[PDB]
């Protein structure tokens, strides 16, 4: 979406290095996971309510 904007010709060229996009998202996903983890470590210390 960011790079090609639904242009078909661009999408087909982008595929020449598609392993790059996968890697960028692995990195962002890892960040998203930590953000939920950080919240639980600070607040959910006691599971007895």
């Amino acid at each position: 979406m960011y790079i090609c904007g639904d242009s078909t010709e661009c999408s087909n060229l982008l595929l020449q290095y598609g392993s790059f996009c996968t890697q960028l998202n692995r990195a962002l996903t890892g960040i998203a996971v930590e953000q939920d983890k950080n919240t639980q470590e600070v607040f959910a210390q006691v599971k007895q309510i």
Binding site: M1, Y2, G5, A32, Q35, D36, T39, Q40, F43, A44, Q45, V46, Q48, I49
Partner: protein
Amino acid sequence: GDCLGDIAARDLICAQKFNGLTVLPPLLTDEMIAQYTSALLAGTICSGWT
């Protein structure tokens, strides 16, 4: 339909979404966080550190 209607608005959030940029929701909601906080305060006042 909100981004399609409000074009004149030039809403930055729609501009980001149309270019593939998405913000994801937190797993814990503000209500849930408040409940954890309340439990810790109730615990402290009633039983201290025990």
